[PDB]
Symmetry: D2
Subunit: 399 residues, 4 copies
Amino acid sequence: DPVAVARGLAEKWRATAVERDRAGGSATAEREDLRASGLLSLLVPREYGGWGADWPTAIEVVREIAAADGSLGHLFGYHLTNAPMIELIGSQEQEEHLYTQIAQNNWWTGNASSENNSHVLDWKVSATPTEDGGYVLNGTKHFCSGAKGSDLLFVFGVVQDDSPQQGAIIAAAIPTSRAGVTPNDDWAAIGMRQTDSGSTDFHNVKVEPDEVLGAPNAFVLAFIQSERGSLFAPIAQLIFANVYLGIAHGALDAAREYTRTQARPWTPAGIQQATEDPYTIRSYGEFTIALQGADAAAREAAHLLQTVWDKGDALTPEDRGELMVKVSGVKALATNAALNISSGVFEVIGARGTHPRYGFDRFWRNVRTHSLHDPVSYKIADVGKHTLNGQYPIPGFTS
Amino acid sequence: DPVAVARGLAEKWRATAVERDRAGGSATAEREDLRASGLLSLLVPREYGGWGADWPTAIEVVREIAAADGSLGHLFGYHLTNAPMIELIGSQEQEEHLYTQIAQNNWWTGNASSENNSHVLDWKVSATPTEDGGYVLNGTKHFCSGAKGSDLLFVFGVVQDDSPQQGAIIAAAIPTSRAGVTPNDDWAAIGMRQTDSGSTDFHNVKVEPDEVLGAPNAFVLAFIQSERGSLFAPIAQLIFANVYLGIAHGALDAAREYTRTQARPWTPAGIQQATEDPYTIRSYGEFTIALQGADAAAREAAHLLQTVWDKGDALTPEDRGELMVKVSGVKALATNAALNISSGVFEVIGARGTHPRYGFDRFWRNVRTHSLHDPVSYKIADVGKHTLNGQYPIPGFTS
Amino acid sequence: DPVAVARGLAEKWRATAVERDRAGGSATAEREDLRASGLLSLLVPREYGGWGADWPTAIEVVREIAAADGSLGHLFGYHLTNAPMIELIGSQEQEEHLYTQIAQNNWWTGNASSENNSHVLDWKVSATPTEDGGYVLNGTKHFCSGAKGSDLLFVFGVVQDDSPQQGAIIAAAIPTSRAGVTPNDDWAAIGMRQTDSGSTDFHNVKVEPDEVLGAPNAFVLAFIQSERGSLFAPIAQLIFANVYLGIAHGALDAAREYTRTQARPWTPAGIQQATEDPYTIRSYGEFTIALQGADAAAREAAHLLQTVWDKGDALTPEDRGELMVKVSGVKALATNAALNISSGVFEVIGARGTHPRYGFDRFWRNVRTHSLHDPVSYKIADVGKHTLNGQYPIPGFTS
Amino acid sequence: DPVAVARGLAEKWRATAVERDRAGGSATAEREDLRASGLLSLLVPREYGGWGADWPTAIEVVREIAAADGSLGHLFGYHLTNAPMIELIGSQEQEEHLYTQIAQNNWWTGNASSENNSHVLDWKVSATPTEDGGYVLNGTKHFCSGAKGSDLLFVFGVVQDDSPQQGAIIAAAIPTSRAGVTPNDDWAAIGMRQTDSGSTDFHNVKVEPDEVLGAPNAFVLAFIQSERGSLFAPIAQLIFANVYLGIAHGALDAAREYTRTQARPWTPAGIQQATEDPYTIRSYGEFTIALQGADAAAREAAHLLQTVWDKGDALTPEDRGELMVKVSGVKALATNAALNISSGVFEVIGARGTHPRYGFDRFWRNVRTHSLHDPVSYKIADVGKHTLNGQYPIPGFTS
């Protein structure tokens, strides 16, 4: 049971959770706990050496880790979205080889991919086609995810050479240790302080032909067609939503334990014990209930993702669309719930809980930070567009 | 397929939904539509002539009807909760006898049972013991459910006699047409106008010995022990929540249809198509998303109810407690979502949509009425008590 | 003391508030109460025979009436907005003559004015120029305000003549009793049921030159220039906002009195006294607080309207602009508080409060109806545009 | 004009707000700015050399400061609660003596006062009576306000000696530099980091007879009787609330400027200007509107505070009660508005705005910390008890 193993790591990590949040930098030791656990091959078929877990199970693992550490939740979760990219646009040969290498070596995969808010011809990383059918990467990807400690890096570049291939997105999986690749210790933010989300430099970085995932612009073409490559956004977004849900659970549990041990009753109102306060009880109710709704929706979307995933290349543009609509709603549900609980929980904790040795603001800071990755407003709009007009979201990296 | 049948009834009923809400009284013709559909025996075991459907399916049928007509959803829905009472405290012979006649005769079951907020010694219907092992009923049950058109009536009376049975709640299933039983044409409310929830008078109504369900005070004892009789509340409460969700879908679908065909864009804002307004789109998103979360939680709870139901008498106080805690949360989720959607949908419908010929306020009026059956605040409180203090709710008729 | 006069009317109207809502039609007797009270000349200057009240006092009067009856609040409030149109675009002579006639004859003013959701050549009322400098009106104004019982009617027509004046909006003040004018007994809605907001047909209705208010397109010119005529919207929107607040107070008071005397405590939760239930108490707090913020903002906006009104024609587009932004916020605050309180009040009232004899849903239905006159989403947007970009609302009939 | 002084300080302090927040510790240079500004004697009567400012003006001064820096806002605001304490329970000679020196020396006043959530014999600071009519203080006050840098310290001690004075709270104002007084450099919290709110040790600290403010137990007596001394809670709570409103404005302004200058439009949605995003516009609208209502309510409470303050001893317990109810609602509004805006502002700011060099989370951390001083839940409950039952708050240090 990967979920039990994940909880084991959580047990270990909580003892250093405050300090690690305070220190920032890379979670080198915890990255190693995860590597050693075997959990990095969670979604690799058993037959290539992995766990062969299904999407609902994998998502439970993300949630468990995220409750202990928002940054480790994001790191591991974003790791899981990477390999499937091999499947969604790569060949059967790349897929077995790379999946096998990932399971065999317990590889961390990282991400230096989409520039979600830039016209492709403005992307900082250029891909120059070479005679042997490969490409050369140049530039800096400024916001990466888990590139720093990774073994295998999933990179996107745009052909900006004024050939007719101009504007083509090139997808590749290359060793992070390839010459010319520098994942920088670059990252600073109020939250998610240990996700290593700084920049990565590429300086005459060679991509071998067999390291290119599918044809040029394979992703953009799959997006337009809503073929299997278009499962990228629903997968990544559902993971993000469950990271937030784990963080909300983490907040709710830390709060509940503090209320049980350290909180004082408000004696001017005649309350005898902090756990008996009628408004404290109500608040925990509402936190639980909001999460109940959000988690049930997350689980439903995960089972829907499994069903669609099981169709392989036989998924329809309606499948992808219905799935993306559902995941967009989970993203919204998770965002709002996690934000509201992360902050609201202080009310039942009380003044002495603001001491930094509790680090109770880390949950909020962690969600407040990543929830800005892409605007929740257009996640809501996409749902409304579908409800009202039956229109599906425009396939892209985040919708 | 009972849902197919119910959806068939839904289309037919929708054409007169506005007038019926405005007229009130009994939906005599639609009740007969239900009788004729064969659907009244939905939850009756296959071996006695019923459909032998499981709880999740029965709930989908309820949701289908509730979306077309809130009163009929509740009426039918509450009907389904009555018979199982036989199973929960009645005997093996009572099940075989009553289930067979319910299914074979296509009987409406009605309800004149608990007075949920009155001390038992204050209940208006007394059961005075008779020598032959029966009872005679006297008094008026001021709030009933479906008694009026029913064939079989489930009644509670309290022994306030002086006998050794004194203070005990007696449950019985007797024919509604028995002498002394007068279900009054009594019901008035801003909403749920066709649910026939008026008073029923009892004047020397004799209950035969084999019509008595379980020992004297069986429900109360089952509650203390959390034995099978204590599933009453989780069942009815889950039924209610899904009525509210059905009503929310009816409101949301009605709005969508009107916005698409009848709504005008706000041209002072330069909007050219009502369906392309960014705030209209956002609002439809928010409605869907709140329902998405509430529906998913309701459905999980339906499966947990099935699980617990299938355990028969081997259910534990732990099984019952966890279930009620989950249903309590669904009741809250559904209450809030149906209220917000029922009311909010007006924002995107527009001024001309307030005309009575649309009856667009019926959804809100239906949810607003029944959501007061028992206070959502203590549904919320019960969840908080479990989350914070690990307490399960005290078993009773509404918790 | 006009507020004292208003409380006197409220006390008179109180016993039959339920009855009036159920009957719909015209509040013929109560419209007469208002006429006899002298309050219709509240905003007419003392020098012309009126009370010469300031805007804050006039708005206090509106709130009293609205608290007693949403429809009468609306009728009286909209009446107050019509008269100033004489001042804002009429000549000094029309001003002295009409103000004097309104005050001396105690005239009801009515409205068959803007078609807020149509470009002018799509307006249903045509204004055809006559040699003598007058106009003839033809067509139907489908949404009117107080036209049915009025003495003086403010009408808008569009020159659709292929005249040189074509496309011009003509504003006029004519007797409702002029031949060819037919205010229909046409109005039906779930709420605001006695506001006589039906259609008015115009059949070759003559408007004399001295009945024309300002130049052709006077409103549009004054708006574009943000001259004094452009105060219509802030005046009208501030009145609307205070009607809603008045209705919110009405619901809150009705609820409280019911809770104090008739609400039952929830005994399964062990509550002995309903007025001591902790969640009931919290809910009344939240109702009061929402109202506390919204009322204080409204009052501040009233004094700002006064300051601006007193600048006469020396007001700048900045004065008008800042004022409208302030009123836009009050409109949003009032809309939301009145909707939330109108409905939420049921939670603390209980099941028996759904009986039609209490008509407790009249408050919500009234606000729910009129809050759709113009979209609150764009009141909110106008505020946001100003906060972020310093942009002022585009002047029109609702902004 | 003290407000012009406050605005001058605030402009300067905004510039170093980010670093000072990250550094924590004491704001020594800024505390010295305040002293030099003359602003510390704001509430000292003109006849003793102070500003003699009225409450609305003093409260505006707190807001100005808080918008720039929440910590300085709390420090200065709490300082201001100390001064009136001389008036409300001291003698006329103490008034002349203490007020003169504060104004002349520009003294910081600090606080080792009430234990708002502790029973009197449980207070850590005991007051042992001395022969000369003075007291000796022993123990450590764990939560102080501005004690560390103060010149004059207001201390409460409880008689726990088994004299006839047992249980009496003794109030005194002593020089902070008195032997035996040790303010520890103790303060740490996620927010309000520069408010110097740590512990202060008292070790056989002598209180001279003329240093005692009023009779033994003067405060508790004043509370029970609702005499003038009982204005402490409404004054402190209104000050607190305006700190939150100040912080909320600070958050809002910081966001608006960032959005205008640094925010990226979301190009997948076809947005060309970030300031033209309809949902970005809506959010700023909503932020503005929440603040609009709360500010107006706050300003209203300050004038009511003036009215009651100006009544001197002729204030009634009803005067006190009504004001405290009004202030409670302001406290609730400000808490909620500041929390929602401090956090929500990140949505329209975007990902790069999470960099620590912007310190944009400092607004939330500051409000989130101090909003826990006393539970807003009971501010809400106090309002509801008044609305429903006409009950007033139990006079104390926070109500």
